[PDB]
Amino acid sequence: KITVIGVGGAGNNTITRLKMEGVEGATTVAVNTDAQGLLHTISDQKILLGKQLTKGLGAGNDPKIGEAAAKEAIEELREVVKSDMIFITCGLGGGTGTGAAPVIAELAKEEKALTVSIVTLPFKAEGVKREANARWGLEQLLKVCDSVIVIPNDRILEIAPELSLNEAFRLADEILIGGVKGITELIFKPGLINLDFADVKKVMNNKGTAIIGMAESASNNSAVEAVELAISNPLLDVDVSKASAALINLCGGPNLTIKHAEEAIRCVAKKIREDAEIIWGVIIDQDMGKLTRATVILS
Amino acid sequence: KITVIGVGGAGNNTITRLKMEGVEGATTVAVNTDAQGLLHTISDQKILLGKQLTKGLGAGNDPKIGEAAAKEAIEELREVVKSDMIFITCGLGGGTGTGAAPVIAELAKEEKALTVSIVTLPFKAEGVKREANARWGLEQLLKVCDSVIVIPNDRILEIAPELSLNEAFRLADEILIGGVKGITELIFKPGLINLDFADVKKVMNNKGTAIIGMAESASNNSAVEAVELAISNPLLDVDVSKASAALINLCGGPNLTIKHAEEAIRCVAKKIREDAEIIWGVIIDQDMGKLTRATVILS
Amino acid sequence: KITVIGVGGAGNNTITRLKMEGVEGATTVAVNTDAQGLLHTISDQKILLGKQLTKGLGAGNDPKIGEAAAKEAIEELREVVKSDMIFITCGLGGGTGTGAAPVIAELAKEEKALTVSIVTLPFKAEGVKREANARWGLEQLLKVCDSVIVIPNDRILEIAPELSLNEAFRLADEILIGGVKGITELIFKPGLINLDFADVKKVMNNKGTAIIGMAESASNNSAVEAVELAISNPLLDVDVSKASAALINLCGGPNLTIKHAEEAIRCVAKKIREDAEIIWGVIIDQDMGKLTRATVILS
Amino acid sequence: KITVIGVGGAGNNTITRLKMEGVEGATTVAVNTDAQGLLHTISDQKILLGKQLTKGLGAGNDPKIGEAAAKEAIEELREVVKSDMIFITCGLGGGTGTGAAPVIAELAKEEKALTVSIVTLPFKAEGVKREANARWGLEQLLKVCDSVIVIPNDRILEIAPELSLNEAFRLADEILIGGVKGITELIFKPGLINLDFADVKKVMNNKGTAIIGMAESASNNSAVEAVELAISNPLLDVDVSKASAALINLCGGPNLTIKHAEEAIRCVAKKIREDAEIIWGVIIDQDMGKLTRATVILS
Ligand SMILES: Nc1nc2c(ncn2[C@@H]2O[C@H](COP(=O)(O)CP(=O)(O)OP(=O)(O)O)[C@@H](O)[C@H]2O)c(=O)[nH]1
Ligand SMILES: Nc1nc2c(ncn2[C@@H]2O[C@H](COP(=O)(O)CP(=O)(O)OP(=O)(O)O)[C@@H](O)[C@H]2O)c(=O)[nH]1
Ligand SMILES: Nc1nc2c(ncn2[C@@H]2O[C@H](COP(=O)(O)CP(=O)(O)OP(=O)(O)O)[C@@H](O)[C@H]2O)c(=O)[nH]1
Ligand SMILES: Nc1nc2c(ncn2[C@@H]2O[C@H](COP(=O)(O)CP(=O)(O)OP(=O)(O)O)[C@@H](O)[C@H]2O)c(=O)[nH]1
């Protein structure tokens, strides 16, 4: 199954937006000490954290207090990580986000499940105190989870600097929703060279930083342009030379030709390490025109 | 009897293509760990592999996992390879394709059967991961079997760089359907130089690689042109200088002349080793007239 | 008695053609391990050679397999070989050909019977395997059998590229049918110089090859022209400057004169080795008008 | 008595010709190894040769086999040679002709009977075997027989090469007809000189080659012309200057004059050896008129 959980106030916003837009095959869960935030957020399972220590009045800038509030409701928390694929979303540098995420990642690992972590670095102007905590959380998180995706918040101010705040954070959510709606297709309707969950587990096992996302294109070179757009999202870290895995899930129509598929494979292969491990596969449907989607994963 | 067994996703695709086209005298069997592929494939015997290890997910990029999975259900596959002629079709460089090829080819050999392997090399621009294990599978398969046919996908891009997705793989499948039609044609319709399965098991139990496939012609030199077309199929490998077999099966109408038949034999006789062995045969019927087919097998 | 047996596919074809045309005073036997050929052949006494070792599929390019199969079923085969005149016809190169002709010839020889063998050589452009195998078979047959008749198959190519294989192998059948109808004539309708089987046993026992055959003529020099046509028959390029036998059997009508008969004898007596043993004979009837048949058993 | 026995195919043909023509006072016997010829020969006593050595098929161009076969049935053979005058007809150079003929000759000689043998040399263009066999047979026969007659077949070519074989051989039969008719006309009916069997025994006792024949004439010199025709028959041409016998007896009519008889006597003695006895004679009957026959048994 697919379970996406949000730890901290930042994670609750991502869970809220993801649930508002709606996804298929994924279950939304929110974990946060402050009961005030959980009241306004919308999801299915709202597992309140350690009220016996926090009572629901926030954590503050102390990851130790977040960890102490965590690792107390583990008996209740263990039931939610009993799935196949999990997406832990947490804004680092805060309170419960930097403390509950490590213990939840370890708990999900002990349940033998694939983990993907979505973190967001704080604004540079927030302060050295606010950024050191986020760096500490990020460095220790990659030792537990096998895939970490980092979205620097200040990057939003360099790509989309004129929006009504919420939609500025919508770009950060775009990566997560795209990855979830792409993976839920990779574990769905097959065809030709269709992949399954085993390939996903192989491509996302003990690697580190990862890049995921999808795009669309309806030009003459539909597959190539869609892949190029998906692999180069503006708000992601531009570092793909040191990559040792890949996954391509072209979902074009009958108009797609073998030359275009081979060109897409060449374009993904030429931008990463020569000794890469490409696990591709094409799903084909006789309902759409030249438009071709492209789900891409790197690590 | 004639059995065609597919291994891996490529094997399932080839078996589906053969079943849709319709083959006389052949029985289709598909074996692959991924239960999704077997669910969405078309075949008579759908023998699932060792789900006790990797139920319904797939071997990924791990030939050893497929090797272990096949050995789990080795008893179930022993009762299906107990035939006369077997065609193991599997796309090398993958998962179960590279792992269920060795143990099933050996299993078929222990039943005293004539083995023909149809494999497809992966794309050159697809990473060294897909290429090294494909080479390993080819090297181990030529050891366990006596006839191996290789059709690299790159050649397809140099033959049909256009048309829909399935047409390229159908062109890859053309040689196998042509060969299975030729083999099932020798058993029926005895001719003047009538051949039988004993002659077939003279050129397929020796040497390594081989080239098979039929063709058609309707000009004045019908037999000669048909033989020249069948001997030089585009996507097949071009190596006829080092050949030590021939199974020419000129099957034309009464309009065929002795000069044309002798010329057709001499055409293949002059393009192979001087010390080669020819086991030719001819079938004559009054229903095709000028049109003459030509089934050719090398080694 | 007159018995003609055929070993191999070529032997079966010759037996079928001879039965189709019809022969009086002769019996037809077919021996070939390939039960597929026997199922569609036309004859009277069919013996399936090698019922155990071959199983009825075929022999392939293995004369040793044919030899073993012949040795397997000697008991049921010796019964039919007990006669006076036997015609063993075969196509060299095959498993049931060169590997099964010497054994049956030896069985006939150790039965006190006159043995005549007719072999068909393979096409020159069929590799060194067929040529060497045919040479070995001919060498091992001429030692045992007393009179062989060799018609290379390329003679049909370089003489009559007229019709299909079904109507050009009939041109190679002319030798055997002409010999049989013309040997069965000696045992009927005694003439003025009446001959019988005791003379045949003398003329067809020297050694080596023979050019037996018959022809007809209707011109003023009926006997001479018919004899010249019969002795220099096509497909027989073997030089006849050396010979030690003759069975001229002029069977003309009352119009024949002493001068014409003497010229018919002399034309043969001048075209062969100077010292020779002519066993000529003449049959005269008031029904053929001017036509004169020219049966000759020159060896 | 007069018995004519034929050995060999030529002997059987001559016996059939003589029986068809009809001769009074003579008995026809045919002896031949092959029963096929005897089944069609028109004769009274058909005594088969040595079936025990060889069945009734043929001799096989071998004098030894025929001679050995004759010795097998000597007991039955002797039953017929117990007569006064015997005519052994045999075609030399063949099988039983060079076989039973010497043994029947010696049997007749032992039985104290007058022996005359008629042989026919084979055609010159029939190889060295036939001529050598004929020479050996003639040399052997002249030893054990008191008189032989040789009429080579090649001589008929220079006399009447425009007649059918069945009728032109009757031209060679005229010698035996004249011999068997002149002898009968001596023993039967009286004459003025009245020669009997004593003179015949005198003129045919251990001499060798001889010329025997009769002729008719009706000119003014009937007796002179009739004698000259019978003394110079076109078939047998030998130097008569060395002859040592004569049986010139005539059968003229009343018109015959003493001068004509003296001239008929003198003409023979003019062209032969001046020595040796001329046992002449005359028969007179009042029916012939000017027509006068002439029989000569010159030796
Ligand atoms: N990209 C985004 N970052 C966010 C968002 N909301 C908060 N954040 C970031 O996350 C960080 C704050 O983390 P939290 O809200 O989990 C802090 P804490 O657990 O102490 O929250 P309370 O207990 O509710 O006070 C900080 O760097 C923010 O800039 C959002 O909607 N998008
Ligand atoms: N010529 C073709 N090659 C194919 C086709 N499908 C797959 N392949 C090739 O075969 C290889 C993939 O092999 P498989 O599908 O057996 C890999 P695996 O066993 O891991 O499949 P899953 O367990 O379903 O993931 C790869 O090189 C493909 O390019 C096809 O239809 N035609
Ligand atoms: N002149 C002819 N040659 C023939 C004919 N059929 C076969 N052949 C020749 O004979 C040879 C083939 O021999 P066979 O048919 O006996 C082969 P084999 O004994 O292996 O029979 P199978 O087991 O049925 O294959 C080859 O040289 C042919 O060219 C025919 O009808 N005519
Ligand atoms: N003048 C004739 N010569 C004849 C005649 N028939 C045969 N011959 C000659 O006699 C010779 C043949 O002798 P035979 O017929 O006795 C030979 P053989 O005893 O072997 O006869 P078969 O046993 O019947 O084969 C040969 O030279 C012939 O030319 C005939 O009708 N007339």
Author numbering:
A (entry chain A), B (entry chain B), C (entry chain C), D (entry chain D): 34 to 332
Copy out sentences from the published article reporting this entry, exactly as the authors wrote them.
FtsZ, a tubulin superfamily protein, is an essential player in cell division in many bacteria and archaea. FtsZ filament formation is GTP-dependent, and results in a GTP hydrolysis site at the interface of two monomers, as is the case with α/β-tubulin. An Asgard archaeon, Candidatus Odinarchaeum yellowstonii LCB_4 (Class Odinarchaeia) (hereafter referred to as Odinarchaeota) uniquely possesses both, a tubulin-like gene and two FtsZ genes. Overall, we report the presence of two distant evolutionary paralogs of FtsZ in Odinarchaeota, with distinct filament assemblies and differing modes of membrane targeting.
For cryo-EM analysis, we incubated OdinFtsZ1 with 2 mM GMPCPP on ice to promote the formation of relatively straight filaments. This enabled visualization of thin filaments, resembling the single protofilaments typically seen in other canonical FtsZs. After refining the helical parameters, the 3D map was constructed that represents a single protofilament of OdinFtsZ1 with a 44.5 Å helical rise and a –2.72° helical twist. Although the overall resolution of the final reconstructed 3D map is ~3.6 Å (FSC = 0.143), the map quality was poor for reliable main-chain tracing in some regions, and the resolution estimated from the atomic model (dmodel or map vs model at FSC 0.5) was limited to 4.1 Å. The map revealed the canonical FtsZ/tubulin fold, featuring an N-terminal nucleotide-binding domain (NTD) and a C-terminal GTPase activating domain (or CTD). The CTD is composed of a four-stranded β-sheet flanked by two α-helices on each side with a long central helix (H7) connecting the two domains, consistent with the AlphaFold structure prediction. The N-terminal domain consists of six β-strands arranged into a sheet, flanked by two α-helices on one side and three on the other. A non-protein density was detected within the nucleotide-binding pocket using Servalcat into which GMPCPP was modeled. The phosphate binding loops T1 (residues 39–45), T2 (residues 65–68), T3 (residues 90–96) and T4 (residues 124–130) (Löwe J, 1998) surround the nucleotide GMPCPP. Although Mg²⁺ was included in the incubation mixture, no corresponding density was observed.
